[PDB]
């Protein structure tokens, strides 16, 4: 018994919280997004990632624990929530996936220019019209600055 | 101001270059043929292109036009 | 040709019907008349001291004649005005509920209005006929 | 200003003798030329209209316009 305004805002904030949870825990699985589909008797959560075998685990054990996690937190009845994993296409055309891969390369210890040119070459090879990666912060010095790496053409307005 | 940009001007010149005998000195018919003979994403841009095309057809009727 | 309240201008109709009610003299004017202000947003009582209750009665009777059914809260909003809140900005303030409730009850006792389904007060058939007769007289006075 | 607020015999027969020979009669006309208050001016305007010395032109609130009757 809820108004339509509050119901639509509530499932918007549910989508936002679910996306934040998935991007916090599935960062090393190439998590590229989430989609929600409400259905009579069942709501389904489609995770769009790259490493679906790591998202699933053995006999989908990580899928079962993720369903149980979202169930326990969002107070769903047993059987009412179901999660599926799906291998996203065009991985080069996914800014979240490219940003996470660059983050993990920089954490492992790759040079900034090498990592950025790798990601821009991969995105340009994947058929994009343009790519642009910016790295900001303390780069080799205490004074912070920003480095830009672009290829192709990008529009802004 | 009513200065028309190079997208409108270039599209109008290309339309006249390859469709001169088909199109007329009337904005309504020029609009009705331009929307089916070219792929323009906006009704506003189609109207601007057809209007500049009609203007250039009047120019062509009063002697030849450079370009 | 027949007349109604809608054929007569509001001000002179209300004046004529208020004078008629005062001359008839059976409206049961409450008694705290000449004490009160008619609104929390007012600052002085009505200047027409010996009247003004017949004016409010004629006004609410004509208002209920034009509408379907009117209650005390609608009347309080209708007669409320801008209160001067001293040095702060002005604001709309509702009028006194006791005055409007008692004049509704007085009109019920003289038979002009009645309790309506879907709440509030609607004009009765006797109220319709004598408001129409007052309209006829006040439209004939100019002849 | 010390405009008279009650009227006596000399003010009464003065207003009765020279509210004629006024082309335009109003509240401020009476206040200025006879030194009476605005309240006495409004009452005198209604009285002189009721006998008929001044003829009304327009009889709005906040502005009363009268001329002489001839």
């Amino acid at each position: 018994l809820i108004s339509k305004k509050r119901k639509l805002v509530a499932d918007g904030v549910f989508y936002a919280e679910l996306n934040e949870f998935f991007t916090r825990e599935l960062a090393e699985e190439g998590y590229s997004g989430v989609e929600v589909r409400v259905t009579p008797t069942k709501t389904e959560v489609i995770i769009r990632a790259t490493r679906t075998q790591d998202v699933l685990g053995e006999n989908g054990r990580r899928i079962n624990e993720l369903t149980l996690l979202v169930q326990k937190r969002f107070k769903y009845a047993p059987g009412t929530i179901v999660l599926y994993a799906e291998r996203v296409q065009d991985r080069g055309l996914s800014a979240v996936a490219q940003a996470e891969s660059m983050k993990f390369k920089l954490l492992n210890g790759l040079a900034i220019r090498r990592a950025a040119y790798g990601v821009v070459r991969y995105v340009m090879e994947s058929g994009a019209k343009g790519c642009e990666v910016v790295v900001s912060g303390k780069l080799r010095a205490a004074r912070a600055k920003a480095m830009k790496f672009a290829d192709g053409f990008l529009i802004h307005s | 101001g009513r200065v028309r940009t190079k997208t409108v001007k270039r599209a109008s010149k290309a339309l006249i270059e390859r469709y001169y005998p088909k199109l007329t000195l009337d904005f309504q018919t020029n609009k009705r043929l331009c929307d089916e003979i070219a792929t323009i994403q906006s009704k506003r841009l189609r109207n601007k292109i057809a209007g500049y095309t009609t203007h250039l057809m009047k120019r062509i009727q009063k002697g030849p036009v450079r370009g | 040709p027949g007349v109604s309240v809608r054929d007569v201008a509001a001000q002179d109709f209300i004046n004529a019907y208020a004078s008629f009610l005062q001359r008839q003299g059976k409206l049961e004017v409450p008694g705290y008349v000449d004490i009160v202000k008619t609104s929390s947003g007012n600052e002085m009582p009505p200047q027409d001291a010996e009247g003004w209750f017949y004016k409010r009665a004629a006004s609410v009777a004509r208002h209920i004649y034009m509408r379907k059914q009117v209650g005390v809260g609608k009347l309080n909003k209708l007669y409320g005005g801008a209160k001067s809140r001293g040095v702060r900005p002005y604001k709309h303030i509702d009028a006194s509920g006791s005055i409007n409730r008692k004049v509704l009850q007085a009109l019920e006792k003289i038979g002009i209005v009645e309790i309506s389904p879907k709440g509030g007060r609607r004009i009765s058939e006797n109220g319709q006929r004598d408001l129409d007769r007052i309209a006829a007289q006040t439209l004939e006075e100019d002849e | 200003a010390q405009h008279a607020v009650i009227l006596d015999q000399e003010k009464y027969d003065r207003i009765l003798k020279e509210v004629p020979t006024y082309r335009y009669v109003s509240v401020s006309v009476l206040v200025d030329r006879l030194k009476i208050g605005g309240s006495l001016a409004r009452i005198a305007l209604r009285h002189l209209e009721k006998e008929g010395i001044i003829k009304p032109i327009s009889k709005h609130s906040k502005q009363a316009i009268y001329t002489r009757a001839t």
């Binding site: - | - | - | 082309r23 335009y24 109003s26 401020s28 032109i57 327009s58 709005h60 502005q63 316009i65």
Partner: protein
């Protein structure tokens, strides 16, 4: 305005619209002056006035005079505008607008 026209017709038997247009034509300022550079001090150079500006400034002078003479006064604004327009239509020099117009023209004549 309606009361003003009634008062005008009572005070003078003329058409009040004719009195209004006579007031405007009489109190439009025919020459004025404008500020120039003047080498660090303000100098004023006499110029002519276009007819539209004459009409605009005539209306402004008439209504400003009426509003100022009605402020803090027992006379109403309609009455004050009535004698303002009547005196301007006569050019009687007891009009605010007539005195302002004369002062502006005199200043311009000095600053030719």
């Amino acid at each position: 305005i309606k009361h003003t026209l009634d008062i005008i017709n009572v005070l003078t038997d003329q058409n009040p619209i004719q009195v209004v247009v006579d007031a405007i034509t009489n109190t439009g300022p025919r020459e004025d002056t404008t500020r120039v550079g003047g080498g660090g001090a303000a100098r004023r150079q006499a110029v002519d006035v276009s007819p539209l500006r004459r009409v605009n400034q005539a209306i402004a002078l008439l209504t400003i005079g009426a509003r100022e003479a009605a402020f803090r006064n027992i006379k109403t604004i309609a009455e004050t505008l009535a004698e303002e327009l009547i005196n301007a239509a006569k050019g009687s020099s007891t009009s605010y607008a007539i005195k302002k117009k004369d002062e502006l023209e005199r200043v311009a004549k000095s600053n030719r």
